[PDB]
Design a protein around this ligand. Structure first.
Ligand SMILES: Nc1ncnc2c1ncn2[C@@H]1O[C@H](COP(=O)(O)OP(=O)(O)OP(=O)(O)O)[C@@H](O)[C@H]1O
Ligand SMILES: [Mg+2]
Lengths: 229, 673, 219
């Protein structure tokens, strides 16, 4: 609701739809599979749009406001958008903010993750896949970004790790916070998982548009050529 | 078997292993629902599935599971079992169990409490025996307390007199004296260990009986008074005071002595007022001076051989006795039917101290039930696990024939067709025992293993002909494996050009010598020349079956290829003994002559843990200069106490164990120098 | 070696106590032809087992978890070892048989700093792109996303079976069976007999995938 949106803005983050609006050209977003209930919304916004006039497919996770866990509908929507992108031959950009998912469980969550992994592996080398981690992601959700071509992180706001600090303390008996276990600096300086880290969400989205300008739409296309001066 | 004869519908077997399976199958034969108890470990045993219902007892150790009074009483009252059967051991002589069950309304199948108490004490047993007018072991009629009385007894009866104290459940305080000098210093020593162990110091010194043979007479009694003796049972072959090989119609015993033994056993049973099935143990020597040793009140372990010779079922008869019906047989009805021999396949390594038990899981198990005249009493199955909480036993093998020679031949055939993979058994030792010349002739004594193998068990000594046969079989298997390796499927893109070699020149390294072998193949026949000698080996050459039968020069031999390596190593079981052979091609051997041998630092100075169990007695500390034969550590395992010596002289560098520490196999315990 | 040979020794090899471990090499030896197994890297990353064997005379690749070492948890070295073996087997038309008893990935700061995410994704990728026939047997445990890694159906695992002791979960096999995560619950003694049969059916498996020069495996 509105209170949840205000709470998200208090941390300095945007919601899924504002992220999509900043990323894409104005008046170019076309949402797909709007009416599916996980409660509606499914905590993921999928669709297609254009960057500088070139087609792209996008999904943005929305666990912070109206999402409980990785329902089958969430992964089904993501798989559908990936299948469309394969069919037409256009890149996929995924904004990962899975800061939630109950107690990090779910029987049908792991099957959906397996489906998404299969789609990533099938798309590997066929269409470019870009992953921007804009919030905390944990568990099996961290392998799909690892399977994509490029991974970007937002400083002080995004995390990537399989097991949280609680399990590490319980088993290995050591004290580490979220930042020093899976923070952006950790994964960009001494882990080799992320490729770049950006100051905040607006800066990350602008740099993502600039980066997207470089790439071809699929592997059947030649390298892009802009106008040179 | 008469199902119409009414008998207790619900029976609980307060035991485990093969005896539980035997009781369950007997009750099923007579049509009785049988419940079985088991600890947590034995939840996957054979007998729990063989029983229609199960009642788990509790913790793994037998002391708190199969010896737990409260748990077994809870089981009885919850399952409403009409009868209880203890088998042997465990609660066979538990008198408090007998009285507590008698307090309830459940019948115990076995001896009465009074007989158990009377016969349990060795002194009371001897006293009752000598009132029973049955010849007993000569010796002092009393208890010796000082060296003077001991030397006087040794002088006025006989110098070879045992210095044996009381108790001795595990054979403790069973030392022997042979002259006047021993009867004082050894008397002091034996008093010392008796005080250390139990402390009652009630000695039972008696004259030594040379070259005896332990004979068992099956006495069947009942509450109706009359008792019947069932032939005999020779159990002369013994290692570490434990029976291994038993033949029922003893060869040394003759008809007059048969009648004498039967009459003496029956009279002693009447004196004891025995009302169940038991065995009378006799120590007849070469002079035919029979001496009553002891009478077990429980069912004997080696009863199936008596069952085979007599054509009778002891379990059914004793359960009918427990029901209330009187004995239904006569001495005239009892006779001998041919011959029968039984061995105990144990989970022990016979090379170490005539049996050093091991631990493991049965990855492969097959019995020779198809072989004629073979009976297998086993309480395990493929995937069964051997544990430290119980007896190290695998099975009992019983073979019966029309003559002793036929029974022995069938037993050898069964032992050669018996598959055990996962643990180290002792089938080899049983094989040499049943093919030994003295054993076949009949000249056997209780010291058979001590003098036949003085240094210990070494294995089967191969004859020249047998060695040639073994080399031929190994070479034939090697060539068969290569030939099978050459067989692919059609490719139609790169056709396989099969090599057309006709002769294989191999170097085979058995034991220490190196032999040159020339093998040629023709269909299913291998012509093998070993050092000039020519042999023809023919077989179906199935390389996947565990047992392979070959026809070496007409002689049929069954072999087992236990292991094979790409480097030429092959562990193969011939005549019950595992041999290691290294087969190479001639060129490979010529090139291998240049390989530098890897020097192994086998300078002793160490001591491992052959017994997987609990080290309960440590007699060394870091810095102890031990000597040859000096005991280092005692480990309780397999419900058996074994003491191990250093075997050499060397100062203890460090001790990595303590008294009462759980230590598995292969663990370094005490470093030496 | 008959393809219908029963393996009754496998019916009680998995202990009921989930904390207690067993040896997967015993299972592998019992199932394969003549109990012959060429183990690859036997002394490195011993919490995973890979190797070559034969089923009904046909070469197969064997991948399994080892609960004896590290309780069967996956880590960087085991992931790399398994991924390379699986990729080789797929590249040369060799069928894969997998035995799954994984309780998840190994936690810690060393694993995270070493790049456990990409190294695990290597094994996920290797199992996902394989177009050779794949047979999967879950023995006891499938916690976490590691279950998806061992080609849990959606990574094209052709036939998947579970033992009556398999405990597929996230943090009993009935949830998996109801959702459709196993084709059957098999008795452990029939394993070999099942697998051989499947390898006869799936020998003619053909899959079509989108064209590409090559893929970008997370090396
Ligand atoms: N007086 C004796 N002279 C010689 N050997 C003897 C004598 N008494 C016993 N033995 C040996 O010990 C064996 C039986 O010993 P004994 O019955 O005392 O042992 P235990 O530890 O009380 O238990 P068990 O009845 O199970 O053997 C005999 O078979 C024989 O080998
Ligand atoms: Mg006795």
């Amino acid at each position: 609701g509105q209170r949840r949106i205000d709470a998200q803005h208090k941390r300095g983050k945007l919601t899924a739809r504002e992220r999509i609006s900043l990323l894409l050209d104005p008046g170019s977003f076309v949402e797909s599979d709007m009416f599916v209930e996980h409660f509606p919304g499914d905590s993921v916004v999928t669709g297609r749009g254009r960057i500088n006039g070139r087609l792209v497919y996008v999904f943005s996770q929305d666990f912070t406001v109206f999402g409980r866990s990785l329902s089958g509908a969430h992964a089904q929507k993501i798989c559908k958008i990936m299948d469309q992108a394969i069919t037409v031959g256009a890149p996929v950009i995924g904004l990962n903010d899975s800061g939630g998912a109950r107690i990090q469980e779910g029987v049908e969550s792991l099957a959906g993750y397996a489906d998404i992994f299969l789609r990533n592996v099938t798309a590997s080398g066929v269409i470019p896949q870009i992953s921007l981690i804009m919030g905390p992601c944990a568990g099996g959700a961290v392998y799909s970004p690892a399977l994509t071509d490029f991974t970007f992180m937002v400083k002080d706001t995004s995390y990537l790790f399989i097991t949280g600090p609680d399990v590490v303390k319980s088993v290995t008996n050591e004290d580490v916070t979220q930042e020093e276990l899976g923070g952006a600096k950790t994964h960009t300086t001494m882990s080799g998982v992320a490729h770049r880290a950006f100051e905040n969400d607006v800066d990350a989205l602008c740099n993502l548009r600039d980066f997207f300008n470089y790439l071809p739409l699929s592997s059947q296309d030649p390298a892009p050529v802009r106008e040179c001066h | 078997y008469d199902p119409n004869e009414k008998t207790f519908d619900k029976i609980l077997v307060a035991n485990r292993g093969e005896i539980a399976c035997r009781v369950i199958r007997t009750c099923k034969k007579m049509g009785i629902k049988t419940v079985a108890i088991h600890s947590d470990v034995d939840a996957s045993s054979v007998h729990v599935k063989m029983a229609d219902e199960a009642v788990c007892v509790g913790p793994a150790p037998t002391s708190k599971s199969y010896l737990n009074m409260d748990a077994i009483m809870e089981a009885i009252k919850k399952t409403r079992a009409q009868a209880v059967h203890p088998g042997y051991g465990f609660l066979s002589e538990n008198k408090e169990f007998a009285r507590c069950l008698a307090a309830e309304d459940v019948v115990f199948i076995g001896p009465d409490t009074h007989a158990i108490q009377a016969m349990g004490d060795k002194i009371e047993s001897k006293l009752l025996a000598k009132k029973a007018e049955v010849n007993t072991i000569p010796g002092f009629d009393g208890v010796v307390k000082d060296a003077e009385e001991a030397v006087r007894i040794a002088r006025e009866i006989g110098y070879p007199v045992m210095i044996k104290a009381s108790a001795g459940g595990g054979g403790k305080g069973m030392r022997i004296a042979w002259d006047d000098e021993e009867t004082r210093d050894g008397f002091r020593l034996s008093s010392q260990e008796a005080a250390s162990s139990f402390g009652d110091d009630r000695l039972l010194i008696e004259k030594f009986i040379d070259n005896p043979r332990h004979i068992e007479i099956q006495v069947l009694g009942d509450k109706h008074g009359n008792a019947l003796w069932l032939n005999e049972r020779e159990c002369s072959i013994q290692r570490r005071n434990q029976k291994v090989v038993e033949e029922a119609p003893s060869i040394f015993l003759d008809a007059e002595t048969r009648r004498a033994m039967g009459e003496q056993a029956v009279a002693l049973a009447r004196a004891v007022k025995y009302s169940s099935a038991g065995t009378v143990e006799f120590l007849v020597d070469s002079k035919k001076n029979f001496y009553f040793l002891e009478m077990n009140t429980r069912l004997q372990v080696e009863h199936p051989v008596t069952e085979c010779i007599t054509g009778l079922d002891l379990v059914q008869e004793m359960i009918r006795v427990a029901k209330g019906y009187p004995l239904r047989h006569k001495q005239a009805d009892i006779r001998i039917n041919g011959w029968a021999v039984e061995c105990r396949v144990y989970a022990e390594d016979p090379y170490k101290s005539f049996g050093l038990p091991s631990i493991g899981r049965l990855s492969q198990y097959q019995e020779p039930l198809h072989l004629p005249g073979v009976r297998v009493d086993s309480g395990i199955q493929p995937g069964s696990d051997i544990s430290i909480y119980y007896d190290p036993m695998i099975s009992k093998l019983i073979t019966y024939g029309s003559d002793r020679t036929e029974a022995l031949k069938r037993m050898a055939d069964a032992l050669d067709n018996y598959v055990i993979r996962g643990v180290t058994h002792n089938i080899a030792l049983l094989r040499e025992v049943i093919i030994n010349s003295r054993f076949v002739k009949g000249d056997i004594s209780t010291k058979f293993l001590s003098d036949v193998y003085p240094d210990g068990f070494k294995g089967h000594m191969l004859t020249k002909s047998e060695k040639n046969q073994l080399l031929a079989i190994a070479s034939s298997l090697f060539v068969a494996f290569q030939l099978r390796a050459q067989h692919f499927q059609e490719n139609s893109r790169m056709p396989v050009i099969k090599p057309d070699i006709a002769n294989w020149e191999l170097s085979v390294k058995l034991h220490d010598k190196v032999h040159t072998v020339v093998a040629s193949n023709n269909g299913s026949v291998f012509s093998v020349e070993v050092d000039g000698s020519k042999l023809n080996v023919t077989s179906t050459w199935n390389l996947a079956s565990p047992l392979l039968s070959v026809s070496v020069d007409g002689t049929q031999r069954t072999v087992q290829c236990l292991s094979r390596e790409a480097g030429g190593n092959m562990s193969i079981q011939f005549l019950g003994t595992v041999y290691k052979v290294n087969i190479l091609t001639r060129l490979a051997a010529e090139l291998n002559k240049f390989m530098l041998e890897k020097v192994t630092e086998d300078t002793s100075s160490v001591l491992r843990s052959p017994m997987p169990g609990v080290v309960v007695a440590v007699s060394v500390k870091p810095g102890d200069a031990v000597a040859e034969g000096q005991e280092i550590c005692v480990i309780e395992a397999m419900k058996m106490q074994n003491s191990m010596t250093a075997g050499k002289t060397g100062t203890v560098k460090s001790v990595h164990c303590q008294a009462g520490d759980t230590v598995g196999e292969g663990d370094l315990l005490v470093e030496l120098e | 070696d008959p393809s219908d040979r029963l393996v009754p020794e496998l019916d009680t090899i998995v202990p009921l106590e989930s904390t207690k471990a067993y040896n997967m090499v015993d299972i592998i030896h019992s199932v394969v032809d003549e109990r012959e197994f060429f183990e690859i890297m036997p002394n490195y990353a011993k919490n995973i087992i890979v190797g070559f064997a034969r089923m009904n005379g046909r070469t197969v690749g064997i991948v399994g978890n080892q609960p004896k070492v590290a309780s069967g948890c996956l880590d960087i070295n085991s992931s790399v070892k398994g991924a390379r073996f699986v990729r080789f087997c797929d590249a040369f038309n060799i069928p894969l048989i997998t035995f799954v008893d994984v309780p998840g990935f190994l936690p810690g700061t060393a694993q995270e700093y070493g790049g456990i995410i990409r190294h695990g994704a290597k094994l996920l990728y290797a199992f996902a792109e394989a177009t050779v026939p794949k047979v999967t047997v879950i023995t006891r445990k499938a916690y976490g996303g590691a279950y998806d890694v061992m080609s849990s159906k959606h990574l094209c695992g052709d036939t998947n079976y579970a033992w009556p002791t398999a405990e597929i979960a996230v943090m009993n096999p009935f949830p998996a069976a109801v959702r459709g995560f196993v084709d059957d619950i098999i008795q452990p003694s029939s394993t070999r007999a099942r697998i051989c049969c499947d390898l006869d059916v799936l020998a003619s498996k053909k899959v079509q995938r989108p064209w590409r020069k090559h893929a970008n495996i997370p090396l």
